Structure formats: C-alpha cells, structure tokens
Amino acid sequence: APSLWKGLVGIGLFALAHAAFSAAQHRSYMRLTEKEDESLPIDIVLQTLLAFAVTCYGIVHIAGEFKDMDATSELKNKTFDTLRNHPSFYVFNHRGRVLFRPS
Amino acid sequence: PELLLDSNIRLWVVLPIVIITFFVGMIRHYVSILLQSDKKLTQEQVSDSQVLIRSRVLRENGKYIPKQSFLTRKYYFNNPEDGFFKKTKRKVMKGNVTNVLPMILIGGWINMTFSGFVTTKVPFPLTLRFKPMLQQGIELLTLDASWVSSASWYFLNVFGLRSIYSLILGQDNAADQSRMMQEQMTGAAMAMPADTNKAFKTEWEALELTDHQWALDDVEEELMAKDLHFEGMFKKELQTSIF
Amino acid sequence: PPFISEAAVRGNAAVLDYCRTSVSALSGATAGILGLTGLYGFIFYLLASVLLSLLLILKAGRRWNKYFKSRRPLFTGGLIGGLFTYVLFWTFLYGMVHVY
Amino acid sequence: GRRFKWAIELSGPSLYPVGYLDKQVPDTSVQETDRILVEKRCWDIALGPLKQIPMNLFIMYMAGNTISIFPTMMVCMMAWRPIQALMAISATFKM
Amino acid sequence: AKVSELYDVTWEEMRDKMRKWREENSRNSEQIVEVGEELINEYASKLGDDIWIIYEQVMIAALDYGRDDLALFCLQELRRQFPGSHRVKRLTGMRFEAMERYDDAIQLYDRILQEDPTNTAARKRKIAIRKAQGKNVEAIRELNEYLEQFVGDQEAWHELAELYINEHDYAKAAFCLEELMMTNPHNHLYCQQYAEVKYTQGGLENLELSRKYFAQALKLNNRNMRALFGLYMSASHIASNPKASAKTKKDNMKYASWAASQINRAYQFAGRSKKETKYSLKAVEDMLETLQITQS
C-alpha cells in the first residue's frame, strides 16, 4: 500500500512540473506579443490544482504513526515470564549445556 | 511585470546561492555533532544525582504506597536525629549560541562578490524606507522596493529551510544498555553545580511539605463495573497460532 | 488518561508538524506557479491550512480520544513558521517563471 | 483449615538494606499550610513582565533612528515575545 | 520445516524479527543461533552497525547453547573492528568464566575497573560470578554495596528481590518490590508480584492489603487471571478466619462470589474455540461449586 501512495505522489509532482512548464511556455509567448493582457488558460490551472490536491493526499498517508497515548497498553501483552530474566545477571550453569555438549 | 532579465543570470545566482546555504547548514549541523565532547563524571556526583531522582519519584509516585513504608522512607530521608542530607556534606569572547556570526559572514561575502545585481522581486508590497535594506548596490530612486538583491534573497533563504532541515533529520532512541549510561550522564550534567547544601535543605523541606493520600483505598469503584473488554480482547488473541 | 507516555505524544506532534510543513511547502509551490496578489495569496494559504486540518481530522475519525487529548493543536498549530516556509517557495517559483 | 484441604504454609526463620528499617518509627504528623508566602511569591511573579519593559525601552533608545538590519531585527522580536506570551495566558491563568 | 522456513522468508524480516527478539530479551538461544549464522552466510553485505549487535547477540546465545567455535569466530571479528573496547572485554571475560579459570576473568574485571571507574557491567558480572562461586549471602552483600553506590538500576532491585525469594525473606523483598513499583506504577506485573509476596507473608492485615493490590492491578490491564484467582482466594481466606467483622465478611463473600461468576463466564466463552474445552469448563465448574459449598 505505501508504494502505491509514493507512486501517486511522484506522478502528481511530475504533473505539477509539467503544468509549470506549460505556464512558462505561455508566459514566454505572452512576452512576444504586445499588450494582450490575458490570463493563463483555465484548463492548465485546473490540472495543476488537481496535482496540488492529489499530492496533498498521499503526503498525509505516508507518515502516519499515531501511537496510543496510554502506555499501559504497550506493556499489556508482555508477560512476567520474559521480564523475570535480565540481560545483566546471566549464570551459565544449566543442564541443557551438558545436554548439548556433544552435537 | 517589467525589467526583462536574462535567463543566464538565474542559472548562475539562484541555484548556487540555494545550494550554498543548504550545504552550509548541513556542514554546521554535522560539525556541531562532531565537535560534541563528553564530560568527566565523578562517582559522587552520580550518587547524589540518583538520590535526587529517587526523591523526585517518591514525590511524584507516592499515592500507590503503603502508608507505613511511606513514612519509613520519609523518616529515612529526614531522620531529625542523624539524617543523611544533614551530615553528608561535600566541599566547595562571550560565546552565546554562535550561529549568527557564520551566517552574517556568508551573507557579507555573497553581497561583496555581487555588487550590482537583481535577483528576484517579492510580490509583497514593501515601503520605500526598506529600499536601503534591499538593493544596497543599485543606484535607482524611481524603482520599487519589490526587486530585492541577493543579500535579502539569502536572508530569506536561511529561514525558508529552517523547518525543512528537521524534515530530513530527526531523533534517535536505541542502545538499551547505553540508554542507562546516557540517563546517568544527562542527570549528572544537570547536577553539576556545587550548591549541595542548599539543594539538600530545599529537598528536605519540600519532602515534609508533601502529604499522603493513599490512592489504593478507592477499590469499590472497580467491584461494581462490567468486564466485557476481556472477551473482545480474548477473541482477538485466539487466531494467532504458534510459530 | 491517568498515565500518559511522552514518547507517543512526541511522535504525534512530530508527525503533525511534518505534515503541516510539507503541505505548506507544496501550497507555496502552487501559489508561485499561479501567481496572485498578497491578500489572495494569504487567503489561499489559510484555505490550504484549513483543508489540511479537515483532512487530518477525517484521518482519525472514531477513537480520536486515545489519539489526541484535545483538538486545539490540530486546528491552531505551526501557523507562523509554516507561513514563513511557505513565503519562500511562493516567491521561489513566482519570479523564476514570470520575471525570468 | 480442612475446608480448603490443600494448604501450603511457608514460614520465615549489619543493617545493609537501604530503607528497610528494624525500628518502625511511627508518630509523624505534619500540618503546615502557609498560603501568604505563596501568594506573595506568585504576586511578584506576575510583576516581572511589567519590569521587563524599561530596559527594552532603554535598548530601543540606544538603537537610535538608523534603518539597519540589526535594529529592525531587535524590534521584530521585541514585540514577538509579548504576543508569544499572550498566546498561552489561559493555562498560566488557570495555574 | 527447517528448509520450509528457510524458503518463505526475506533477510529484512529476519533482521526485524531478531530486533524484536532483542527488544523482548527472550531466551531463544537455539533460534537466535539458528537464524544468526544464516544471515551471516547469506547476506554478509551491509548493515555493519546492525551486524555488530547481531554478532554479540549470536555469541551470547552460542555461549548458552553448545558452540564456542562461533563464539570465538564472532570475538575475532569484533576485535578486528574495535581494537580497544570494554564491551568485547566483558564478553570475553564472560566466555572465560563459562569455560574455566574464573580468576583470570576476575583480574580482567579489576583491570577494566582500574581503566574506567564507572563500569556497572563488570561489577554485575563479578557479582554473578560470586553468586555461583560462593554462597548467596556474600553476593547479596556486594549487590547491596553496589546498589548503595549507584541507586540507579531497577534490574539490580529485581535481582535482589529474586535472590531474597530463595532465602524466604519476604520482609526485605516487600521493600524491594515497593521501590520497584515506585518507578513503574503502570506495570501491573510488579503489583501482582508484590501482592503475591504479601499474601505469602500471612496475617489478616497483610491479606487485606494483598487483596486490594490484587484488585488494583486487575483493572489496569484486565488481561490477567492470576490476579483474580489471588483476590478470590484472599477473600475466601479472610472469610475463613474467625477474627473479623461481620460486614467485612459479607462484602468479602460478595467479592469472592463475583470473582466466581467472572471465572465461570471466562471459561464459558472459551468453550467455543475447541471441542476439548468443555472438559476444562466442567472441571473448573465443579471446582468453583465445591469452593462455593465450602464458603456457604
């Protein structure tokens, strides 16, 4: 799922860049002709707004963690069996050691 | 829109200045990380630091504690006869977040290199009293203040990426074994100053100022209730098998 | 509610700020691509921020109490710094296309 | 008792323990409520912002009337500190 | 199943699973070693920072399981990258203590202490060495001295409590578990263990305190059935004792009866999972009925 969102964001960014290039070409043509104070066509403006909204949707979905405020639910499935043993004090005197000695 | 500019000035000014400021910020961050040095720590200072943490957790979490043990702890800390805080006594340019000088120097060098230039105009209407700010090298009185020079461009650029820098970077939390050592280091770095006597007296009086309110007495609230979470919870524990 | 973990709150705040920054940065690029007056640009930035806030609220929906204690930071948060980084990218592509 | 049948019973036969005390030492009773000093302290805390203005007045006088980056940056943050302190007066008022 | 498990797997999932194993600090030295040398021979390309901790964990597991050859194989690689590192020295001393000649690991620990004054790991390993070498009383003494000198480690508190458990000293273990509960009030496990220790002590007031702490941890998680069993047994025992008030006996009987219905329903909706759960349900049903006749 995240890969699809990343691809959609990339496609939206590419569409935005293409709309930018089209607007730049429009302004370059406008500089050619005297007067004719007209705005850029509305179709490209709608396309760039569509690219603005599409990339704005996946940018929220990419980084969603929203971890729970309560910390009692994170030590909830953990049992006391694993907590009893500690990495610090570790005695290497067990029957399994001499059981596994020969293979 | 006027003042037709060349297309070969935008490719030799804007991109260079943007890359320069970006990588200057990156250099500053990485060099600050590199120059960071650890501080020597005496076992005694760690000792009183952990004692202070213990007093703090006693103050914070004291409701879920038997009353007898609570007064035992409070007496041991206080102990008017001997007391541990009372007897145990020990014996006793202007660099201020230097980040403005480098940016000022970089902006000054950039402005010195570019004498007469027009980088970009700002859409925002600006007054004529900021014209000496913005141009600083162009001899024009009829021109508007919208067209700014490279100095203001870089000045706005350094603030433009201030929040962008944190997007690439972030925080780190690992090394469970080294986490404890980090906690001791930071806590004793808090407890560096040599004012042990007044801190001990302040903590001694603050501990007396605390009262006791056993939060365990309110048990009747749970007895009259409903246990239905323990089967919606139990239904979602069954599907998982054993690896 | 009695016990609160600071790590979860910090992560939530970091995610919210990252989203607010990225959305503002792209809104600046859009405004620079179109090119408007200051009043219209500021109103457009405010509209984009409101739309982002509405989408963020819709993202949570049900069970938002455990996710966020309140809603004030979701509505009002990162409005000045986000505008500061939006002004950069608004004028970055504005004069690059029109003036140049 | 025999009603429970199975009844496993467990018996127990230098002061190194940190807090475990041989002597119980009860009879602690502290009733101290000194609100007037707290009120005087909190009253003086709210007087700090009123006194924090005169030296910024003196600094703005020392700045002069020269249009430059350093003075305008001083002035921009001179008013930002109050407005940033006025964005969260609700919590301070409540506490 | 070995080849089958080795087929439907990726290296990323292996590394994530081992990271989770390290987070849970479980004992699966067999499985840790089994996946350890596999990622060492299959990928052996990148993630050096991860692979250092990987090597350390693998040799820790191999010291436990059966294999010192891989232990030395990882020791030489760890020494190659870091010439002077106290962690490698501690691990080597641990392996030496495992093999023979504990005194050599001992003077290694004193040299480590001479170099770095603040080294908790070396002192903990010395304490564990004298735990198994001599009597536990001396080890308790040194642990108390170190806990005086730091007063920072919760693992030291829990180890002291566990060591005091074998000596039938619940008076000091009560203080130890109270201190351990101070720092972590949301951990119901420590509350359950403290209530367990207090119940074992005996006495009506200790019984009431243990019952109330059993009840506190019951509402924090709603996951544990040990706590509810302990609460029901405490209520039954306080009902048994003649030295009590009438009204407290009635309310404790009500507590026990409600716990009985909770037991009945918890075993009841567990019966729809399998077809052999009905026998466990009837077993626990006769158990509760017999204790109900006993109480009534």
Author numbering:
A (entry chain E): 2 to 104
B (entry chain C): 4 to 95, 111 to 261
C (entry chain F): 11 to 110
D (entry chain D): 12 to 24, 41 to 122
E (entry chain B): 2 to 297
How did the manuscript describe this experimental structure?
The ER membrane protein complex (EMC) is a multiple-subunit complex that is highly expressed in the ER membrane and plays a central role in the biogenesis of membrane proteins. Specifically, the EMC is responsible for the post-translational insertion of low-hydrophobic transmembrane helix (TMH) of TA proteins, as well as for the co-translational insertion of the first helix of some multi-pass transmembrane proteins into the lipid bilayer. The EMC contains two distinct transmembrane cavities - the hydrophilic vestibule and the lipid-filled hydrophobic groove - present on opposite sides of the complex. Here, we present cryo-electron microscopy structures of human EMC in apo and VDAC-bound states at resolutions of 3.47 Å and 3.32 Å, respectively.
To address this issue, we applied various computational techniques including optimizing the box size of particles, selecting particles with maximum resolution of 4 Å, and utilizing no-alignment 3D classification. These efforts resulted in a well-defined class of apo human EMC with an overall resolution of 3.47 Å. The apo structure of human EMC exhibits a tripartite organization, of which the luminal and cytosolic modules are consistent with the recent structures of human EMC. In the transmembrane module, a three-TMH bundle of EMC4 adjacent to the EMC3-EMC6 core is ordered, forming the sidewall of the hydrophilic vestibule. Collectively, our human EMC structure unveils the complete architecture of the horseshoe-shaped insertase cavity of EMC, which is enclosed by the L-shaped EMC3 segment and the nine-TMH bundle of EMC3, EMC4 and EMC6. The insertase cavity opens laterally to the lipid environment of the ER membrane between EMC3 and EMC4, creating a ~24-Å entrance for the assess of substrate-TMH. The most striking observation is that the EMC3188–210 segment undergoes a dramatic transformation upon VDAC1 binding. This segment forms an L-shape architecture in the apo state, playing an important role in the formation of the hydrophilic vestibule. In the apo state, only a portion of the TMH2 in EMC3 is visible, which protrudes away from the hydrophilic vestibule. In the apo state, two dynamic elements located near the entrance of the hydrophilic vestibule TMH2 of EMC3 and the TMH and C-terminal cytosolic loop of EMC7 remain idling in the membrane, primed for the binding of substrates or cofactors. Within the hydrophilic vestibule, the EMC3188–210 gating plug adopts an L-shaped conformation to provide enough space to house the substrate-TMH. Taken together, our apo conformation of the EMC denotes its role as an insertase ready for substrate binding.
